[PDB]
Amino acid sequence: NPNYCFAGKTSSISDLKEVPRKNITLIRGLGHGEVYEGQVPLQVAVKTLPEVYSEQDELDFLMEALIISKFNHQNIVRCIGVSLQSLPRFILLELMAGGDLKSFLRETRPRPSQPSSLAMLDLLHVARDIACGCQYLEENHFIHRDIAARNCLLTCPGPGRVAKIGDFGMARDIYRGGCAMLPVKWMPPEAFMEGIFTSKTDTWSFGVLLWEIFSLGYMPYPSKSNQEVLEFVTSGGRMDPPKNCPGPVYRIMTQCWQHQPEDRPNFAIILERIEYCTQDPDVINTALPIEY
Template sequence: GGYAGGNAWSANSTNGEGGYSFLDPSRTIPSMSEARSGYHAGPGSLLVIPAIPGCGCNYRCLALDARRSQVACICPKDWKLDSDGKTCILLDAPDTFSDWLIVILFLMLVSLMIAFGFVCVLLYNRYQHRTVGLVRRKMISSADLQLNRLPVASNNMLTEYNPNYEFAGVTYTLKDLKDIPRNQLQLQKALGQGAFGEVYQGFYRQRSGDAVEMPVAVKTLPALSTHEAEVDFLMEALIMSKFNHPNIVHFIGVCFDKHPRFIVLELLAGGDLKNFLRESRPKPDKSSSLTMKDLIMIAIDVAKGCNYMEENRFIHRDIAARNCLLTTKGPGRVVKIADFGMSRDIYRSDYYRKGGRAMLPIKWMPPEAFLDGIFTAKTDVWSFGVLLWEILSMGYMPYTGCANRQVMQLVTSGGRLEPPTNCPGPIYGIMTQCWHPDPDQRPNFKLILERLGYCGQDPDVLKAALPVFNRAPSQEKDVTIMRPGSHDHCIEVSKAAADYLIPTSLGPNTIGSTSSVDRLIPDNSDSWETSFVIPHSKSTQPLLPEPEYIDEVTTSSVSCETAAQLTNYEKFFRPPICFLEPHLYQNL
């Protein structure tokens, strides 16, 4: 740049206004780049000396005066002059090779670290898997060894060796259980808590490519289980795998490759029989969907399953409505026997000589079972009689209002459950035959099936009405025990009655008639309290207190125990839970 011409002078003069000077500082020496507007007043001149090559400069030579007595080297844009004053160096020139080398080395180092960590994790997992596998194989081998040795007799007590549990004389091991690949099993939702762990509803594909899924119930054994629970779980799987009958829950297979372990069973969507009966009770404003024919068919289904077990010399030991499941609640229902937990315990040598605590269904057990520890096929016959009573009472609790030790005293003294309301005589006759004190005199299940079949064809039996309930019981457990103020309202049981007293039959007007408990209710009473005098038992065996299932403890015999104070709603109807005094049985 240089001077720029200014405006023409307004006066008649040869000179115009002063111009402006511009110097580009990027191409000049900083000391010479100063420019001011109007710095020079008056005429001026500009000497332009172009930069030229030479002078020993790497790029160009710049004259600092008109005579070029002083020169300086300059460099192009983005270059700078080196310390020698002649060489040009590129400004901020990146070292491309060095940067890429650093990046590559860093990536290689990270990759090596990742690979090393992966190898370490892989080796650790392999070590853990091998260690856990050895432990589990040792555990399974130990459990399998116990299963193989279970049928061996003990010299301490003959009843510890029970041939009914040898599965037709053949010893079975875990290898006989059908293994289900875990990836073909899908759990959907929890159904409830079982004896070992959660029970789930799920779906099972028989082959990995199948589109059809079978609904199943899956019993689980969690990883943190005791060795005893492990053996029990395996034993239950072995027991259930041996049955193949339409009235026994179908065993599908097991997943024992790792924890949690699974037992896969068919899914019975109808729920348990006890709750089904309670839900189906007729109300004053609503009749039941069930008929007497339906109740008989339910009993026949259970009897068929029991007959199959009896023919295969197997004892269930806990035949009850709570342990029977239904395929559906609607028409076409099939009842199946489930829950073989009590049967599983027969393999333990300490069951008959318990040093700890065990849960026993006292209200469903005959005297020889809870007093002497004797379990035979006729034990299940007695239990079936109580189950039949549950069916005809629409799911009522047997011996309601009595504790288990009272029930033991009552049963050993000859007392029995009274017939449920509107119970046909022939069906109650089957019950009393099942409750015969002499096990040899009780019918087998083949005979029970025959008699139930006759009942299902008897018009007088089929037209019997079901009991009507104003409301469902709010409690399923025994209610509060109250001691009476006087023995006037006690049902006297003869103190001369022998253990296992043989009951005698009722008169023709007794079946379905007003019970002995009704006679104890004061007129216009707002509460209902009944009491029972139970004589001293002649047995020296330990008695077992607690509801429905009872912990075994040693205790003395009980004389006069009290009955229950029933809730206020029960004054509106006569519940079918009364007991027959021994002197009422005649000619059975």
């Protein structure tokens, strides 16, 4: 069975915490593989491997469990354990009741009915949370490869929410696919041209995540196809600021999108800049757009 090394330790499937299947109860679907809300009473999200999947899918599923299980950080979803000795195979994750970040942003947009549903500080706190997760990954020499709103989760809908990175499927595939499935809209030039990935890959992607956050859940590069983005970005093209986006926040995005990786900030610097934004009244007092 496949092994996995993180920090200074190597791990195997035997190291995963097996939870007896009889202790696990599915409660409801959460938005499907398929994902359920479950109980172990400990509340969990249950990631399932469809029995109709192949052997490579099995190994990938397993590797993802190993990956998440070896992290220890507040802004990365916890793995409660697995149930691998019964079918279908389960991975048990920390239940994040706020759901994925993209859906949250789109559904929580300030409206005439909910004008104060979200403010700039809430968005900055989400960004800080994920940047803190990214900093942990960077300092432990782990490259995520698909930092994007769809891959982040929230502990809860309301004000005390904490954002975490919740999916590691792309780092898993590369660890051991199609062109039209590559997240090119989140990738820097050296990644989609040369297949070169470093921590500065994730910096670029984080810039795109920031745009997603401050646009309140829009698809990056509106109206552009993947190939059009590839050509646009290679030629020096960059997204405009999201509506009402404060200059200091947009500045972090454009720094994340520097053409040369050496010119992009590491996550320690990104965190410092996000923190300064949270201190600036002119940033956090900026009203978000209210769609009618």
